Amino acid sequence: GSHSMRYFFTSVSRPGRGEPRFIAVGYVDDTQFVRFDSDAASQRMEPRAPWIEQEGPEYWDGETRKVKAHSQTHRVDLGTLRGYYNQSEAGSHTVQRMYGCDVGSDWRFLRGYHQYAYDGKDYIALKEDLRSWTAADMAAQTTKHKWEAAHVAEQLRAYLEGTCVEWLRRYLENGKETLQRTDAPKTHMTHHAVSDHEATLRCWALSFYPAEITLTWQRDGEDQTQDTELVETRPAGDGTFQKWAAVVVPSGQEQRYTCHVQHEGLPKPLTLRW
Amino acid sequence: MIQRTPKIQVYSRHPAENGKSNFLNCYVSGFHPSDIEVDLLKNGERIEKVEHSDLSFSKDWSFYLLYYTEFTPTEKDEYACRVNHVTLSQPKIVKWDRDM
Amino acid sequence: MMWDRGLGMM
What we know:
The PDB classes it as immune system. The entry lists the keywords pMHC, immune system. The complex is a heterotrimer. Chain A is 24% helix and 39% strand. Chain A is of the alpha+beta class. Chain A has an eight-stranded antiparallel sheet with strand order 4-3-2-1-5-6-7-8. In chain A, strands 9, 10, 13, 14 and 15 form a five-stranded antiparallel sheet that branches. Chain A has a four-stranded antiparallel sheet with strand order 12-11-16-17, with no helix packed on it. The longest helix of chain A has 28 residues. Chain B is an all-beta fold. Chain B has a single domain, classed as Immunoglobulins (Immunoglobulin-like), CATH 2.60.40.10. Chain C is largely without helices or strands. Helix content of chain C is 0%, strand content 0%. Chain C has no helices and no strands. Chains A and C meet through helix 1, helix 2 and helix 3 of A and loops of C.
């Protein structure tokens, strides 16, 4: 199977309330293991997984220094971006940052990425070639100019092809029992009449990993998109996730509708009928 | 300035059963910006032992949070999640539907 | 691990 590691960085300015609020979280696929908070009393990188507490002091304090370098970076990025859009200092703004690498079944380098976003909208992102960039607006073109003239994209590809992938292999070994697991979703459907001639058919999928899953409804072969009530994949809090879809059907023709669950943990795509 | 309505989901970690301690989760996702008030309701009042997950976001740069606490389900006690955001005119409250 | 270097400034 394929695995991934991602780091997420969020900085929100506080006009007239001091420093900006910085938060950083690291992930291995859909499993969190590190995290930092600017308002926490610890003021250092904290573990958020049992298999990551095995690290020594060099690893712990070494990442606290790098998350502080990322925090002060966004602190300066807010003032620079504020001038790119001619904004005042009385408004709060958000800069978002994420990068990481992917590995396949053989745990070889799949794809590396690094993207920025200012106030929700995309700003700049490293392409798949890991050497050229993609500027969203003209304000991002200014950032592209400074980073291509300094040739700073090659050191990024050096980190995405080495330190990221090589240390991603380590976590998959130290947390082998928790990371290289694939739990099949527990599927079922519920029936509840909402009106005299209407009923709600909710297709369920519980306790699955990873979180990516596809639950779809079909009526005798044709798929439903406008009537299907889909909610985002929610986590149960124990590592596994949940998801349900629903369609309101006239009472009496429920035998025509069928739910289809697609998940990698399933040996074959299963179908629930009536 | 992009704004997105949050997606509230009040649910339990395990199938609910009266007399067995469980966990009540209020999953908020797909919102922007990050500033948001999330409160869990106990019989009409607020739970003060609420723990929350760490702030993260998705590919669309929309944030998501997981608020959870330990509780004992009961048919008499009512639960809900009070969420307040800049996109919401009034404080939206989603009641937990045990059977769905 | 995280990145030790940087991309420069915006």
